[PDB]
Amino acid sequence: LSELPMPSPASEEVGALYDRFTALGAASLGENLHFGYWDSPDSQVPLAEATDRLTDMMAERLRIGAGSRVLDLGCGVGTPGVRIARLSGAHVTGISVSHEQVVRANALAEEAGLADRARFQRADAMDLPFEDESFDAVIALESIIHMPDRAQVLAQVGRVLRPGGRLVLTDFFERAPLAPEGRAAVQRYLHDFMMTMVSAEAYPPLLRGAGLWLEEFLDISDQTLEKTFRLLSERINSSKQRLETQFGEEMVNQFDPGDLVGVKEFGYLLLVAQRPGK
Amino acid sequence: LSELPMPSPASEEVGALYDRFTALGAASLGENLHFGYWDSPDSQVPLAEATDRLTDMMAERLRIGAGSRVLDLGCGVGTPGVRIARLSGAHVTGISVSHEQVVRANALAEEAGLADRARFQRADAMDLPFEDESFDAVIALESIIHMPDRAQVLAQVGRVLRPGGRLVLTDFFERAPLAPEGRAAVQRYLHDFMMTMVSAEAYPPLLRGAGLWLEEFLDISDQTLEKTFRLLSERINSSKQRLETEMVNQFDPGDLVGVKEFGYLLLVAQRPGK
Ligand SMILES: Nc1ncnc2c1ncn2[C@@H]1O[C@H](CSCC[C@H](N)C(=O)O)[C@@H](O)[C@H]1O
Ligand SMILES: Nc1ncnc2c1ncn2[C@@H]1O[C@H](CSCC[C@H](N)C(=O)O)[C@@H](O)[C@H]1O
Numbered sequence: 230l231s232e233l234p235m236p237s238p239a240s241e242e243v244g245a246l247y248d249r250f251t252a253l254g255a256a257s258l259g260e261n262l263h264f265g266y267w268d269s270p271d272s273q274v275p276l277a278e279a280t281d282r283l284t285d286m287m288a289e290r291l292r293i294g295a296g297s298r299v300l301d302l303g304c305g306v307g308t309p310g311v312r313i314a315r316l317s318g319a320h321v322t323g324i325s326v327s328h329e330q331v332v333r334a335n336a337l338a339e340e341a342g343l344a345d346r347a348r349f350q351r352a353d354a355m356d357l358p359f360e361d362e363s364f365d366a367v368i369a370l371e372s373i374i375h376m377p378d379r380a381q382v383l384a385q386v387g388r389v390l391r392p393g394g395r396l397v398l399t400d401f402f403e404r405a406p407l408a409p410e411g412r413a414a415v416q417r418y419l420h421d422f423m424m425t426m427v428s429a430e431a432y433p434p435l436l437r438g439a440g441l442w443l444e445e446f447l448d449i450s451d452q453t454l455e456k457t458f459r460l461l462s463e464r465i466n467s468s469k470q471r472l473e474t475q476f477g478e479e480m481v482n483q484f485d486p487g488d489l490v491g492v493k494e495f496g497y498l499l500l501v502a503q504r505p506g507k
Numbered sequence: 508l509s510e511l512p513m514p515s516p517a518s519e520e521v522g523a524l525y526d527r528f529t530a531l532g533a534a535s536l537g538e539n540l541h542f543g544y545w546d547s548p549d550s551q552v553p554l555a556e557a558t559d560r561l562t563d564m565m566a567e568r569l570r571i572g573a574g575s576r577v578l579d580l581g582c583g584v585g586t587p588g589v590r591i592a593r594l595s596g597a598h599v600t601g602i603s604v605s606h607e608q609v610v611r612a613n614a615l616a617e618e619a620g621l622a623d624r625a626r627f628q629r630a631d632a633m634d635l636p637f638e639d640e641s642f643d644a645v646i647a648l649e650s651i652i653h654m655p656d657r658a659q660v661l662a663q664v665g666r667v668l669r670p671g672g673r674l675v676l677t678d679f680f681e682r683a684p685l686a687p688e689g690r691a692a693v694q695r696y697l698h699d700f701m702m703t704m705v706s707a708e709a710y711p712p713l714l715r716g717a718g719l720w721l722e723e724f725l726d727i728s729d730q731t732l733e734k735t736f737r738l739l740s741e742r743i744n745s746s747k748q749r750l751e752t753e754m755v756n757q758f759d760p761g762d763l764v765g766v767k768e769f770g771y772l773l774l775v776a777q778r779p780g781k
């Protein structure tokens with residue numbers, strides 16, 4: 230339960246960060262700023278494809294259709310959100326704290342001919358500028374991790390969620406006590422990208438506080454963490470002489486995940502909760 | 508969290524409780540003692556198939572093939588266990604605390620041609636008579652609720668489970684504080700059947716307290732409890748009216764339909780390794 234100290238991040242500073250590193254940040258991982266998912270560690274499926282997979286299994290738990298209002302916490306550069314709009318015909322209002330993101334994403338929407346179905350705007354998940362009960366579902370795809378007060382953000386979502394709506398999020402967590410051999414690389418990731426791990430036993434009281442019932446906790450670490458890490462550090466270290474223009478000698482080393490393969494009590498989780506009603 | 512009084516079962520008393528049930532003909536040969544599971548509240552699958560469906564749902568989570576040794580932690584009349592051995596070819600070893608249960612469990616495996624692959628014995632989960640690291644998987648289908656201490660039963664399962672093996676259980680829990688108009692029927696159910704609820708935040712500690720990382724927590728309440736109690740009540744009521752040719756205090760379980768905060772959980776925890 231924070232056996233390692235944690236960065237305690239500030240949402241507007243988070244925006245400063247993505248503003249910095251969604252620029253040659255797309256040229257390293259690509260368009261989906263979240264983990265990939267594979268059926269077993271041996272899979273040969275490109276990361277491109279496997280990240281879309283996680284979008285999809287999180288989208289599916291939203292349980293939406295054409296003409297569903299959906300809230301995209303932490304919209305990224307637009308790709309997972311534009312995807313849900315194009316594929317499901319639901320309407321997606323998405324929020325980010327970085328200006329450079331909210332622009333790239335309106336653009337993705339605009340180039341998909343879906344600017345009326347998928348609008349992206351600047352707002353703070355700690356203060357949601359939306360009438361109560363104006364969303365059928367909320368997807369927070371690798372977003373809650375950067376945020377200052379989980380208990381409040383969840384309380385914000387529980388307010389906008391119509392009765393019966395469902396919240397689908399990812400988060401980082403301690404599967405059990407940290408191997409000390411690796412508290413380093415996690416102390417470095419967690420700090421260098423302004424994040425925070427949580428205890429699996431936190432979410433239940435955490436969601437009830439927000440007015441939501443847990444529905445599904447799922448440890449997806451064995452399908453998510455390593456194989457991405459092996460590939461992103463490999464993508465990066467195949468052109469580390471391209472830091473000669475990217476400030477990578479100062480910033481891609483913070484992004485290089487190779488130090489995180491193997492950290493076995495380091496945990497990634499899928500979660501779904503439901504506000505009662507409907 | 509235990510806002511209602513919760514009784515503390517003795518594992519001897521729950522055996523004495525199921526002894527009386529099993530030989531009353533209630534828990535008869537080939538019947539499941541656990542909730543049915545449906546996908547939609549309007550789904551008209553009959554009771555027997557829904558109950559089999561829960562059994563199958565938990566079984567694949569065990570992730571077993573033929574040649575898997577599976578512990579049936581709290582096995583009743585052996586219906587789920589025999590079916591798991593029959594459909595998987597896994598050697599299943601069930602344990603119960605009710606002697607009159609373990610008897611009819613073995614008889615069911617006998618009638619199936621499975622007496623060699625579906626074995627039952629009288630034993631308390633609190634003290635598993637089994638070597639360390641002996642089981643590829645353990646399933647606790649509606650059992651852990653009767654037991655006197657989860658953190659010990661969990662430690663015991665965690666002992667016998669081989670590294671990599673998995674634990675699948677259902678359990679009761681509080682979705683959210685209990686509503687007054689329904690604190691009544693819940694308090695009666697947990698006393699009359701010697702059962703206890705947990706906080707859902709309880710489990711990841713308890714499981715860690717047994718050297719098991721949780722893998723999957725699943726509130727299945729909206730699929731299980733309501734249709735079952737409806738279906739159960741009609742029988743009880745019909746039976747009473749059929750006995751017109753009197754006794755009218757047996758806690759109609761339909762006193763529980765509508766108590767939306769009362770929860771049914773499905774859990775999958777793993778022991779790291781394999
Ligand atoms: N407090 C906050 N309020 C709103 N958005 C936030 C936030 N903290 C972090 N975010 C957003 O969370 C995102 C993390 S990256 C995830 C992006 C998107 N889910 C994708 O998968 O592509 C960033 O876009 C960042 O702006
Ligand atoms: N302390 C304990 N140790 C072992 N088994 C126990 C126990 N307390 C209760 N049980 C068993 O747990 C079961 C609860 S009823 C579930 C029976 C079985 N899953 C079925 O569906 O048919 C009974 O078999 C009961 O005997």
Ligand SMILES: COC1=C(C)C(=O)C2=C(C1=O)[C@@H](COC(N)=O)[C@@]1(OC)[C@H]3N[C@H]3CN21
Binds near residue numbers: 246247254371422
């Ligand atoms: C390899 O794919 C990525 C994984 C697995 C991450 O955990 C992760 C990102 C990725 O691209 C960053 C996005 O953007 C920048 N700067 O890389 C991010 O931290 C800033 C934001 N979602 C969080 C943490 N994190």
